[PDB]
Every structure is written in C-alpha cells, then in structure tokens.
Amino acid sequence: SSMDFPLANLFFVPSEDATAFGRRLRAAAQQAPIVFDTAFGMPILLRKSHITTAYRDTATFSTRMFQAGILNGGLAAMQGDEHARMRRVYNMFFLPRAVSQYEERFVRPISEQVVDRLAKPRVDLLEDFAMELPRRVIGELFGFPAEKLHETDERVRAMLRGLVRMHDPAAVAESQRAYGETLGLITEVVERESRDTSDTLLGEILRTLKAEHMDTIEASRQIVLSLILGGYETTSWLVANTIHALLAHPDTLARVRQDPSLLPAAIEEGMRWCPSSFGVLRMVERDVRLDDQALSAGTVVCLAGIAGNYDETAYPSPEVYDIDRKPLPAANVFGGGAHFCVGAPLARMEARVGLQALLARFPGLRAVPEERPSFMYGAKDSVAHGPDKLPVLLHHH
Numbered sequence: 541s542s543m544d545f546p547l548a549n550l551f552f553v554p555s556e557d558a559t560a561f562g563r564r565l566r567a568a569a570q571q572a573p574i575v576f577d578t579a580f581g582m583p584i585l586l587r588k589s590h591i592t593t594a595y596r597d598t599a600t601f602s603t604r605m606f607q608a609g610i611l612n613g614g615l616a617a618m619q620g621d622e623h624a625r626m627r628r629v630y631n632m633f634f635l636p637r638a639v640s641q642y643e644e645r646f647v648r649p650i651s652e653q654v655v656d657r658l659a660k661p662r663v664d665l666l667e668d669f670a671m672e673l674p675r676r677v678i679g680e681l682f683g684f685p686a687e688k689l690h691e692t693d694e695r696v697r698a699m700l701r702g703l704v705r706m707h708d709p710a711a712v713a714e715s716q717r718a719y720g721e722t723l724g725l726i727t728e729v730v731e732r733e734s735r736d737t738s739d740t741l742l743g744e745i746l747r748t749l750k751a752e753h754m755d756t757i758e759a760s761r762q763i764v765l766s767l768i769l770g771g772y773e774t775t776s777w778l779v780a781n782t783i784h785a786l787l788a789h790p791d792t793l794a795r796v797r798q799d800p801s802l803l804p805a806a807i808e809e810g811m812r813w814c815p816s817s818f819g820v821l822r823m824v825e826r827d828v829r830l831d832d833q834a835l836s837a838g839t840v841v842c843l844a845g846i847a848g849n850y851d852e853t854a855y856p857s858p859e860v861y862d863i864d865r866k867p868l869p870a871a872n873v874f875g876g877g878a879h880f881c882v883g884a885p886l887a888r889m890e891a892r893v894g895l896q897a898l899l900a901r902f903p904g905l906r907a908v909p910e911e912r913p914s915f916m917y918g919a920k921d922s923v924a925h926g927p928d929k930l931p932v933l934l935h936h937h
C-alpha cells in the first residue's frame with residue numbers, strides 16, 4: 541500500500557554475482573529514496589536518514605504487523621515497556637560469558653564432528669555444512685535429535701515466508717498451518733526440558749524465564765520458536781554467504797586459514813558484501829512525511845538498511861570483498877534500534893567457530909571451478925539472499 545513511488549524489482553532477481561543484490565539496492569537508492577517493490581509487495585525505504593530515524597521512532601514505525609501472525613506473543617511483536625522487559629530477559633542468554641560456554645560445550649565439538657563428516661563423494665557446503673551445523677547446534681541446545689529438526693525445514697521456511705509476504709493471504713495461511721504442524725514438536729521440547737529437573741541450555745533458559753516470573757506456555761513456545769527460526773534457518777545463510785565470500789577470494793581465504801583471528805572481520809565484511817537479509821519490516825502508525833515522500837498510517841514498509849552496504853562514500857570500492865576495512869562495517873543485517881537481533885552474538889560465534897573448523901580441516905578447500913552459484917533473495921524459498929549451492933573440492937592442498 542503506497543503512492544507516488546517508482547516500481548522496482550530488487551529482490552527476486554537471480555545473478556551469478558553475489559554483489560548484484562547490494563548493487564541493485566544501492567542503485568535504486570541513488571534514483572529514489574522509496575520504491576515500491578512489486579515482487580516483495582510494499583514500499584522499500586532505501587535512504588539512510590529515513591532508516592536510522594525509523595529504527596529509533598518505534599511509535600511511528602512499529603512492529604505491530606507481527607501481532608497478527610505466528611510471532612504474536614513473541615519478543616518481536618512486543619512494543620514499548622513490555623518489549624523492554626522481555627528483551628532484558630532474552631539478553632541474559634546471549635551475554636559473552638554464556639556465549640563462550642556454548643562455544644566450548646556445543647559449537648566447537650559439533651562443528652568438528654560436522655566438518656570431519658565431509659571427508660563424502662560430492663560436497664556442497666550449503667546443504668552439508670552451512671545448514672548442518674546450525675541445525676545440529678540447536679539440536680543439542682534442545683536435547684533433541686537433529687534429524688527431527690531437519691524434517692521441519694519446509695515448515696520453517698513456510699512460517700518465515702508468511703512473516704515477510706504478509707500482503708499475501710496464501711503465504712499467511714501457510715505460515716499459520718506450518719506453525720500448527722510444528723506446535724507438537726515445540727510443545728514436546730518444552731515439556732521435556734521444563735521437566736522435573738534435567739539439563740539443556742534450554743532448561744537453563746526456562747528456569748530463568750520462571751525465576752523472572754515470565755513463565756507462560758506462550759513465552760516458552762516463542763523462545764523455542766526463536767531458536768529455530770534464527771539459530772537454525774537464518775544463521776545457515778550467514779554461514780553460507782561468508783563461505784562463498786572466502787571461496788570467491790582464495791588469497792583472502794588463505795590469509796584467514798593462516799591467521800584465524802581474521803575470521804570476525806571476514807564475517808563482518810561478509811555481511812556488508814553479501815548480506816543474507818534485507819533489514820526489517822515496520823508498520824507506519826501515523827501519516828508521515830520523509831522529505832518529499834509521504835507514507836500513510838497502516839502501510840507496512842521495509843527498511844532496507846543494507847542499501848548502505850554499497851555506499852561508495854562509506855565503503856570505497858564496495859564491490860570488493862576487503863576484510864581489512866576499518867573500522868569494520870556496521871552490520872545492517874541484524875536490524876537496528878531496540879529490536880536489533882538479540883541472537884547476533886550466537887550467530888557470529890557459530891560462523892566463526894564453524895569456519896575455523898572447516899578451514900583447519902581442509903587446507904585444500906576451494907570452489908568447484910565452473911559451477912558458479914546463483915544468488916537471489918528468496919533462495920530455496922527462504923527469506924534470505926544466498927547461493928543456491930556451494931560446490932567445493934576439499935583437496936589438493
């Protein structure tokens with residue numbers, strides 16, 4: 541629902557160049573501050589000043605559109621003080637100390653097992669590594685088998701598609717259907733790990749929720765749901781895009797293999813160069829003017845904060861994957877303001893620890909030379925921008 545905005549098609553466009561997405565967004569930002577994306581179904585805010593303002597004025601740009609779907613009752617759908625309260629609690633699970641504990645207890649072991657398992661006939665690091673690792677990690681946080689989560693794949697994406705394409709009745713309906721079909725699993729996990737007294741990081745989370753007097757069936761389900769949507773599906777694509785960036789720049793890959801301390805930068809520059817999400821959705825709560833542009837109350841819009849990822853003035857030669865950029869580029873993929881991804885520290889860590897294992901174990905790692913991946917937003921019916929595959933050779937050396 542928009543007005544005088546140029547039509548555009550920025551998201552669902554395949555390209556063999558992983559930079560195409562970023563460039564397109566940037567190119568559109570230079571033509572106009574707001575466009576209407578016909579495939580994505582809403583006005584897209586592209587100018588940094590509009591976006592940074594919008595992240596901070598939550599009463600004008602709210603997350604109330606999430607109150608009408610499966611995320612109702614979760615953190616993202618909360619507003620004002622209710623959100624602040626609950627965010628305080630979600631924050632406790634992602635503190636540096638907690639995140640390191642997860643690294644030693646789960647993510648390092650699991651990443652090593654996942655990687656050794658590849659030493660397989662025809663390796664695709666998307667399905668065999670980037671999807672595998674986060675799924676197994678969530679498996680272990682729940683005390684639940686990873687193969688049972690793997691069968692939720694199509695449901696997890698159906699759930700997510702209805703959170704983005706909410707202008708689409710069928711996507712919304714399938715999102716609800718899929719949640720209902722996954723409620724059993726989610727409730728089971730909650731019951732086992734809220735049990736008498738047992739031991740999963742999930743158990744610790746549920747005991748914390750109770751200690752803070754926020755223990756409800758909805759809250760417990762929503763946390764579990766978060767861990768699935770973010771810590772499994774969304775994290776996968778961040779790992780995939782980072783890998784691709786390294787494979788596509790073998791000098792940089794070599795440097796990183798020789799000095800793993802370069803990994804955090806490799807990941808942050810990854811998020812700039814080849815971002816896995818677009819930003820965020822927001823509901824305009826009052827008629828608002830943004831320079832010459834007008835938006836009506838009731839319009840859902842997208843803040844495409846990644847349109848700055850290719851601003852030459854901030855990141856010269858934006859097409860170039862340069863892990864030496866300093867300061868490191870600001871991570872627009874996690875959103876902004878009060879709703880900024882609370883799981884980021886876990887996600888960044890899974891990527892670091894997973895990649896380090898991979899590069900340690902296969903010095904010979906390289907892309908298969910003329911099977912170029914294809915990139916688009918909507919890859920595999922997800923809500924990520926990502927490759928369709930990442931075929932690799934693990935030797936010579």
Ligand code: HEM
Pocket residue numbers: 603615616617627630766767770771772774775778816817819820821873874875876878879880881882883884886887
């Ligand atoms: C790794 C586990 C993850 C978990 C458990 C998780 C969880 C969450 C939660 C609960 C929120 C809502 C926070 C709030 O409203 O205050 C959130 C927001 C968000 N997360 Fe994640 N997340 C994860 C990973 C990721 C990854 C890898 C990405 C993107 C690459 C991502 C992108 C986002 C974005 C863009 C938002 C903002 C939505 C908004 O501001 O409206 N997250 N995450």
